[PDB]
Amino acid sequence: AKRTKKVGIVGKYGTRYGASLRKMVKKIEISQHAKYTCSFCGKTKMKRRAVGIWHCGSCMKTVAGGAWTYNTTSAVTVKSAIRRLKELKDQ
Amino acid sequence: PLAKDLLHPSPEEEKRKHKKKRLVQSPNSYFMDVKCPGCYKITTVFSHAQTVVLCVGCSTVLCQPTGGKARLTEGCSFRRKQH
Amino acid sequence: SLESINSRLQLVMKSGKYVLGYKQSLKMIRQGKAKLVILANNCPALRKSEIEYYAMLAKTGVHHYSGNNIELGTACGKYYRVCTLSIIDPGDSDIIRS
Amino acid sequence: GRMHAPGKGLSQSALPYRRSVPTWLKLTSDDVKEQIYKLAKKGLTPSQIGVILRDSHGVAQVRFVTGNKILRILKSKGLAPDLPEDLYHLIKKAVAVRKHLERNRKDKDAKFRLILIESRIHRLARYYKTKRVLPPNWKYESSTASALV
Amino acid sequence: VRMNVLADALKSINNAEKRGKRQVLIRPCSKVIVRFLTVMMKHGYIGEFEIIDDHRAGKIVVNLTGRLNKCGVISPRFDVQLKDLEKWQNNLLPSRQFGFIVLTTSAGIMDHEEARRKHTGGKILGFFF
RNA sequence: GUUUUCGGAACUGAGGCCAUGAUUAAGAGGGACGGCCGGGGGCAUUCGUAUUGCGCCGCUAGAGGUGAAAUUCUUGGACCGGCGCAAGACGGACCAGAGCGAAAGCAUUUGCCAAGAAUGUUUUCAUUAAUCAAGAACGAAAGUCGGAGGUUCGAAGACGAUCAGAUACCGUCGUAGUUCCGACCAUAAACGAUGCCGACUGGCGAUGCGGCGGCGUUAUUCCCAUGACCCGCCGGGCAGCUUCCGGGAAACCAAAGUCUUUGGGUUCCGGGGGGAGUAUGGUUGCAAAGCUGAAACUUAAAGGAAUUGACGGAAGGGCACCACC
RNA sequence: UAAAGUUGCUGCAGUUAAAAAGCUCGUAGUUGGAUCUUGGGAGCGGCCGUCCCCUGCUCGGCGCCGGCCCGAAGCGUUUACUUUGAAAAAA
């Protein structure tokens, strides 16, 4: 059954820390515990080891990533930006 | 005008009307007996073929699909037929 | 051009003989029965290099696929991931003529 | 008018009155079928067998040269695809627009088109169920749909 | 969409009469339509009509006289007893002298007076005067 | 006792025979395919002046702003001219009673991604359809919550005028906002104040897209074929003009027509004016609020279209020393 | 209660008077294209009106020379609709 109405993972905090702080931590705490698909082996095993460090439990390959997400949006725009200046310098 | 004769429409205007709006539904397309100059064999192609067709022996192309009637390759002799 | 391959691959999975996986398709290269080898783009670089060398010995072409092993598996109509794949006999597909 | 668009267009084919075989056509009721058999084996949906047939070979309607229609010809030989072609092409379209949508999630228009497409799938599905063409428990599920190209 | 086919036929020949056309064309032809036109033709309200029977739902070209005031259709087809048939032609027909209520019975399709002679009612189709 | 012809019940093999069994392919619908088309959508990229600011150079005393001024800037060099630089907006003219989109809405370039109408169709499927309580997606602006950015503009606020007073209009600054990203909100005169689907009922000249036909002209040039014009026809698309179709209280409407000659199908929704979209209950939301939604009481009118007057710090003509010059 | 076609099924209204959800999707609900047997015959009245026929497969007497005629009993897609009859308290 659906145990809670609108309090997901953050149900562990009970009635503490206020509603908004318990709401904006939910989106983050769902992310930092989700298992991602490893882009190297394909299996859904990318799991955050420590802050910024993401380890794939299958191919045993460690990746430097965001603090709470696997990929920071600021990073993916930088990777695509560098990829354009790279081919633009060497032509 | 009030009095017309819809039982006997004149053919000059019957070919004007839309294919479905005619008194008896009839198509506007037809078939061809095309003979390319590179070869001698005769192929049967559709007026609005809508798919590229090649002659035997990969001699040459015959039709180019377009919005309406296919564009026949200049140099090929075609004879419209009917059944 | 890519959708032609999925159209070809789908035609192979229903008609032709094929071999999914690496240990199994490596034998078919060794037996000479393979004719075309497909490789997911995220194949391990050592294993990709080994397959390409094997095929050079057997003179069978390789087609380095675009998708990874996830969507190569769905291209074969399977619910598991496929990293490498060999077509033993296309049956009635035009995949080997391209 | 179109059932998922405001267009009221009037454009379709119009077969002639005479249902006879054309006087130019020299293919027998048999040989046309083996032509259908060959194209069906190399992979071709009954819709596009008909077009290839009336351009290269010049058959007006297969329903006139023989006594059956294309899909009825293939199913009697067992070469027909399992799930119907118009339902196949809708799932194929929904899979493409869903794959476009996973990256481009700000495309509210694509999200809108997806609902229109899926609504057409569930409409054909419950039709093909009453005609007992699909198993009564068949169900298009967005997840497992991509396996069916 | 086109739900009732008899309704599209009557409203067309009723429109073309108000305009004064000599002959009108109706797009779909059904068995009930041609059975309806004959009831009007046997009373002199329309002229000679013709069915252009192609390989689809055919078309009818009805020669029109100036004798038709209105040929309406009652939808849906209510069931009519012989007890309430007088009450229908009391508020549907102009006068008791002329006008007819076409209604289908097991005996076929006929006007309301023939339904009096054959002593059987049925579903009501339309009316013309 | 027994086995059977015998009547019944059931099964199982080989037949024979049937005119051996599939209506059509909708000016219904879906799908395929063809060449197009479009400020449709998304992402990325590119360019453009302008505006503001800064640096430097020039020459200078005012510059701004207004009905008129002041607040404001200014020899610590403002404004103006030149050359640069940076930033964030915006996408002029071309731009139309043109296009596209379900609506909201959509306009520098180029690339990528998926979608679509209409047209063409002797393709396929064969009634799969229409409208839709419940339910769902999208939904301008403002507003809300997080980040990023903040040029211009500018609620609030401050001030200068005006005024009997102005906490307004006008002027100088200027916060939130305006911009982007990610979530909320679900309302607009969200308007054509006009549900959707289908049929029928006058013309006329255009216009946009597709197709078909046709003199001639002009481009490649080397003609056919393609473009650009020119004359038509077909489909549907935004519209227009016209009229005793017909309707309407009329204004007006080819739909608001085919309605006492009243019935094509189907959703929503109104019942004198107020009280009142209020109270209350429920529900949604972070909030603002949204949705649902009374009654007591009060009242003889409120209202629509049109007419004649009067009036106008409305316009156009004309007049008078009881008007002015 | 009629008047009230001011509750409108018969029979209202929704451009501006009260009024069409911002828009689309959508399940119940409602509504659904065309298509499968007409004609001929005997009789009667002045081409027209009316009648009958296009029913199949146990028992008996106008009987007659296994067959035929006739009478009765049984069976022959299903509803809606319509016609008939029954059964249907009085006041």
Mapped to the 3 state alphabet, what secondary structure does A2-17 carry? Answer: CCCCCCCHHHHHCCCC
Per the listing, tokens 């004007």 go with B16
Nearest to E101 by CA among E65, E60, E91: E91
Q: What is the identity of the amino acid at D147? A: A
Instruction: Check A37 against C70: CB less than 8 A apart.
Output: yes
Question: Residue ranges per domain, chain D?
Answer: 26-80, 81-149
Q: State the DSSP code for E56.
A: S
D82 contact to strand F (CB, 7 A limit):
no
E123 contact to strand G (CB, 7 A limit):
yes
**Cβ–Cβ contacts within 10 Å for residue E12, how many?**
15
CATH number of E1-68: 3.30.1370.30
For chain E, the residue count is 129
CB E1 within 8 A of CB D3: no
Instruction: Check D58 against B50: CB less than 8 A apart.
Output: no
Resolution (Å units): 2.8
Domain with CATH 3.30.1370.30 in chain E: 1-68
Give D14 to chain C, closest Cα distance, Å: 32
Judged by C1' against the alpha carbon of A24, the nearest nucleotide is F146
Angle (CA) C5 C11 C14, round 5°? 140
Both structure tokens of D21: 């075989």
What torsion, rounded to 10 degrees, do the Cα atoms E16, E18, E22, E28 define? Answer: 20
Q: Is E76 helix (H, G, I), strand (E, B) or coil?
A: coil
Rounded to whole angstroms, how far apart are CA atoms C88 and E26? Answer: 64
Distance A76 CA to F91 C1' (A): 29
CB C93 within 8 A of CB C16: yes
Nearest to E84 by CA among E110, E108, E115: E115
User: In chain E, positions 98-127, which contact chain D (CB-CB < 8 Å)?
Assistant: none
How far is C-alpha C32 from the geometric centre of its chain's CA atoms? 14
E55 touches D at CB < 8 Å: yes
Residue closest to F210, CA→C1'? B67
User: Residue B31's beta-bridge partner residues?
Assistant: B46, B81
Nearest to A7 by CA among A30, A37, A40: A30
Question: Residue ranges per domain, chain B?
Answer: 1-83
Q: Is E123 helix (H, G, I), strand (E, B) or coil?
A: strand
Both structure tokens of D95: 């899979």
User: Residue E104's beta-bridge partner residues?
Assistant: E109, E123
D96-109: burial string, b at 16+ Cβ within 10 Å, e else: ebbeeeeeeeeeee
Rounded to whole angstroms, how far apart are CA atoms C40 and C81? Answer: 10
Is the backbone peptide bond immediately before E76 cis, with ω within 30 degrees of 0? yes
Question: Which residue out of E27, E55, E56 would a mutagenesis test of the D interface target, given it has the greatest number of D Cβ atoms within 10 Å?
Answer: E55
Residues in contact with E64: Cβ distance below 8 Å, sequence separation at least 6, in sequence order: E13, E16, E17, E21, E22, E23, E24, E46, E47
Q: What is the identity of the amino acid at B29? A: S
Q: Which nucleotides of strand G come closer than 7 angstroms to any CB of the protein?
A: 10-11, 24-27, 31-36, 81-84
CB B19 within 8 A of CB B27: yes
D120 contact to strand G (CB, 7 A limit):
yes
Chains B and D touch (3+ CB pairs under 8 A): yes
CB D140 within 8 A of CB D125: yes
E40-72: burial string, b at 16+ Cβ within 10 Å, e else: bbeeebbeebeeeeeeeebbbbbebeeebeebe
Judged by C1' against the alpha carbon of E55, the nearest nucleotide is F24
CB E45 within 8 A of CB E67: yes
Rounded to whole angstroms, how far apart are CA atoms D44 and D75? Answer: 14
CB E81 within 8 A of CB E67: no
SS3 content of chain E, % helix, strand, coil (to 5): 30, 25, 45
Residues in chain A within 8 Å Cβ distance of C70: 37, 42
Per the listing, tokens 């790279």 go with A86
Strand E79-80 to A36-37 pairing: unpaired
Rounded to whole angstroms, how far apart are CA atoms E66 and D92? Answer: 59
CB D79 within 8 A of CB D40: yes
User: Residue E49's beta-bridge partner residues?
Assistant: E62
Q: How far is CA D22 from CA B70, B83, D32, in A?
A: 21, 5, 14
Nearest residue on chain C to A41, judged by CA atoms?
C42
Distance E98 CA to G39 C1' (A): 32
CB C8 within 8 A of CB C59: no
C62-84: burial string, b at 16+ Cβ within 10 Å, e else: beebebbbbbbbbbbbeeebbbb
Q: What is the DSSP string of A50-90?
A: ETTEEEETTT--EEE--SSSSS-HHHHHHHHHHHHHHHHH-
For chain C, the residue count is 98
Residues 42-101 of E with CB under 7 A from strand F: 55-57, 59, 69-70, 72-76, 91-92, 94
Residues in chain E within 8 Å Cβ distance of D19: 55
Surface-to-core class of residue A29, CB atoms within 10 Å of its CB (0-12 exposed, 13-18 middle, 19+ buried):
middle
Q: What is the identity of the amino acid at D71? A: L
Residues in contact with C20: Cβ distance below 8 Å, sequence separation at least 6, in sequence order: C76, C78, C82, C85
CB D49 within 8 A of CB D36: yes
Helices D85-103/D108-130 angle, 10° precision: 160
B27 contact to strand F (CB, 7 A limit):
yes
Surface-to-core class of residue B3, CB atoms within 10 Å of its CB (0-12 exposed, 13-18 middle, 19+ buried):
exposed
Chains A and D touch (3+ CB pairs under 8 A): no
Q: Which CATH number fits domain E69-129: 3.90.1640.10, 3.30.1490.10, 3.90.105.10, 3.50.30.30?
A: 3.30.1490.10
The phi and psi torsions of D71 (rounded to 5 degrees) equal -60, -40
Nearest to C26 by CA among C41, C14, C43: C43
How far is C-alpha C93 from the geometric centre of its chain's CA atoms? 14
Give D13 to chain B, closest Cα distance, Å: 8
Surface-to-core class of residue B25, CB atoms within 10 Å of its CB (0-12 exposed, 13-18 middle, 19+ buried):
middle
Nearest to A17 by CA among A9, A5, A25, A29: A25
Per the listing, tokens 């010049």 go with D58
Query: Hey, which chains touch B, using 3+ CB pairs under 8 Å?
Result: D, E
Surface-to-core class of residue C91, CB atoms within 10 Å of its CB (0-12 exposed, 13-18 middle, 19+ buried):
middle
